[PDB]
Amino acid sequence: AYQAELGYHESRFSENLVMLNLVEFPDIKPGDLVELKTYHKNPSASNGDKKIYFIAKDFDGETKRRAKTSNVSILSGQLQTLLDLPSRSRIWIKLKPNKFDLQADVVEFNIKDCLLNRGDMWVLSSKLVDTCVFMDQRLAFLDSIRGTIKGIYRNGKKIVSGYIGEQTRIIFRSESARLIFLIQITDEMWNFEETGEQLFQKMVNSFFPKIFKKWKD
Amino acid sequence: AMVLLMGVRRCGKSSICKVVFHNSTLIDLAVMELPGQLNYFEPSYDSERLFKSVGALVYVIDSQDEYINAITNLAMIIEYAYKVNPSINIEVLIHKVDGLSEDFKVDAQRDIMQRTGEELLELGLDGVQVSFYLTSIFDHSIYEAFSRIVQKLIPELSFLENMLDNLIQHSKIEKAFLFDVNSKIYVSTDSNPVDIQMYEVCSEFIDVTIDLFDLYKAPELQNVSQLANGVIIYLRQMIRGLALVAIIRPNGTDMESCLTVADYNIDIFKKGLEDIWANA
Amino acid sequence: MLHSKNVKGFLENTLKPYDLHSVDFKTSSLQSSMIITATNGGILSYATSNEINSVNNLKMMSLLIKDKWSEDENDTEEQHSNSCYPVEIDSFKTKIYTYEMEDLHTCVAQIPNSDLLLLFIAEGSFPYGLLVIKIERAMRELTDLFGYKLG
Amino acid sequence: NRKKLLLMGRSGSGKSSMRSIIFSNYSAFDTRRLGATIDVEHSHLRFLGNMTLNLWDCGGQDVFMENYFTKQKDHIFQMVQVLIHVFDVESTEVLKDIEIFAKALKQLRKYSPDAKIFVLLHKMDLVQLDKREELFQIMMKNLSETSSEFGFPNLIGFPTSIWDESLYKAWSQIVCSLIPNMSNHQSNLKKFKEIMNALEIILFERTTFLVICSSNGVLLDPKRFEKISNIMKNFKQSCTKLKSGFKTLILNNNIYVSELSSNMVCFIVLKDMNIPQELVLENIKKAKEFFQ
Amino acid sequence: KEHEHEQKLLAREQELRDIVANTNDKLIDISMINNSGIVIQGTDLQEALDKRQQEETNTFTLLSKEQLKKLHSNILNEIFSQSQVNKPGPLTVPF
Ligand SMILES: Nc1nc2c(ncn2[C@@H]2O[C@H](COP(=O)(O)OP(=O)(O)O)[C@@H](O)[C@H]2O)c(=O)[nH]1
Ligand SMILES: Nc1nc2c(ncn2[C@@H]2O[C@H](COP(=O)(O)OP(=O)(O)O)[C@@H](O)[C@H]2O)c(=O)[nH]1
């Protein structure tokens, strides 16, 4: 493992999420998958330690020229709030070289309040290759479509961040969709269950209000 | 750099003025409100000297009410504002957005931007860039918007950025703000992103400092506030109404040594700031 | 506890120069007189012979002097140094170190069996032996501050 | 050292707002979400390190108020040290409030007549600024005439609201009537003021930030204690954002705010601006074990 | 006239860059404080030797008592008398 100093930068300099100094620790080539774990042995949950995957990219010319330590720079916004670390802290770096073996199995997505075609989903998934994502990251397609990565799965574990490869089964769940209900009105609707409730009474008192409350939540 | 506040009646210009400036170039001067109702504009009714005397024009749009006519009136204002002087920075504030979701706020801002761009395309104006800010009185947004508006009217911005970057790099400072004594409008900072939580901490530190000083008067403001984890918050009044607020982390060092080196470095920075006429 | 007024008056009195009458030998007053701690080197009390900038510069000089004294206090090699004057007053042993700071003669002495330091700074024309005698007789009169530790 | 405090009033008088802001660390804007207190809500609060405060947030609604003086009269009003009756100036049934207060005074005189009655005219921010003092005096004359009838020769009142700092002063003077060894604290604070040569030294509590005692008991603001309490509460709520706790604050090397102990916060204003910080901090640290 | 303003702006850029460089040159870090090397142990004889080094054999040959014995003791007494510093009061006060 390696050691690096954490840094933050605004969107004016660079648009990438995580940037590291390529001139320091030159074991890492420009195109790699690099862990950003903040723990060196004995991981702590109460203290707060996370393993955030990302893809290596070099510093901006303006930032590298007018530099002030900070071997690794994280773009502000959502990733900084997820990591929750001060402006100068101690982090660690690995060089996991198995991109194929570290592919996430299922990456979720949300397409709320916008119509994506099936081919649009295919194109958006094609653009999301060799790029690492994390939970609740607002991806953008055509500068108007908004996404939300609500779940990354790998070997039965819901990892906070994962790597999306060629063989990643990325799904596109819809948070704003057309729904059709087909209620059967039969002779059994006025029948009574063993507790003492009619089935249509259940339908109008416990299924629909709960599903509307859940949909609103 | 006198900024002009324009908007429809009951949009919130007077309340914004009260909240900000009541609680030249850089100081918080007496800004000019302007109630602009829907009408036909008189051609050159001795308003050329007024708009030539405005450093940057600020427009206020109420997000609660219908705003298409507001955008149309704004386009009519810009149609002669850019013609009279092509060096005026034009700012638009989307006020009263406290009770809206993030998605609704972004969609409203995008719709306002598209409508303003299309209306300026219809009027034939080219080479004009209009900034948009989502502002509200109840939070920090109006302060940050006015900070950006003021920063657009200081020609010595990059040199102050370099000076603060050097000061932070040689004093173990986490984040240093060059505030002003009134309105809590921070004038310059480093290349580090402006954290909202740290900005609110520094603003309430300014309020606590000014109030505690005002409680004991009638006998150069300096303040050191150290927390439990060793993190200190420093204050030192600069030239004219400017005040420097910095958050310095000890990094496992002596508190008094850090205070001494920070005091000497900040005094050197103030001596350097004496040469440049950034005050007032 | 401590009293700032009496310590300030004591430091102001130790800023007095020397005027010898049998031999015409006038000496200037000390540049600065102050008392600093043995842990962080910050100024507890101070007094100048003759404003905020000078206070900050004196604090920086006190930090530098304490930083140089810290390594000398924890070193036992080359103990027979010509610039060390270890005096024992009232069965209390201490070590006095003299330093040269560009054009300023700085001499410090730890108050024995305590976490405090006594520092005298004068100009480059001031003799070192007179400084040693001055700080020895100053430490002779400071018996009430013996055995004082920071809270 | 258990002190039983009673917090009574009419419905919507803002008793729970006072309890939340003073003790439970809620903002003024966060009192709108508070529900209606059903029956009596007990709150065991530890003041300093030895005192505990048994504050009884009574209901104040008509059924609860009628239940207090009929069936629970032998439980609510026994072994009571301080009554804090809260009056609302927005109420249109002021005579009913005075009659309820008279019944409470009668029960307290019947059971524990050694108590200390305090009245707070809450919600005195909706009324205009010109008539606040006149309305307070008009209601206070009637409340003192009523109070003197059912025993209790003295009755101290305060115009209070949650949108200013008078609540801190009122609760500080309510609490300080129960704090033991106040004379020793005053003597030690006077000794420390003489030793450090300070203009005025004020002693607070660390958690609630209420005034405990002052050195004095250039004209200064008579309402400076409550304003310093409000400013310190705001500064503590600001320093909670930095994931840490407030420890020290020095202003112009003349106003020293430091954690004197684990239960008190000192507020020292000196006279000479040339004293170095380390000497004042060392003298503060010497007195840290003295006030314990 | 605007070209004169352009030259004025170029002079402003040079002056402001000089102002930045000037205030940048006085920045002292804690590493500079810890490893300054300014505070060095100096004796009177070593200071005289360095003075002669910058300015630029057994000279002495081995061959009243009352006057020298009086004057040495009087000089020591006059040195010790003026070093007697009397406090204006107690240093530490009790409770
Ligand atoms: N919620 C909310 N209301 C606002 C805000 N700004 C202004 N207002 C409302 O606007 C009203 C005052 O408008 P005013 O400043 O007098 O309008 P003007 O005289 O035309 O500038 C108040 O009743 C406020 O409720 C805001 O940021 N948030
Ligand atoms: N405007 C204003 N409202 C107040 C004040 N004090 C309390 N309130 C209101 O009182 C409500 C809460 O009342 P509550 O404490 O539950 O009354 P209680 O149960 O009788 O003690 C909040 O919605 C506040 O708006 C005040 O000083 N000013």
Ligand SMILES: [Mg+2]
């Ligand atoms: Mg209640």
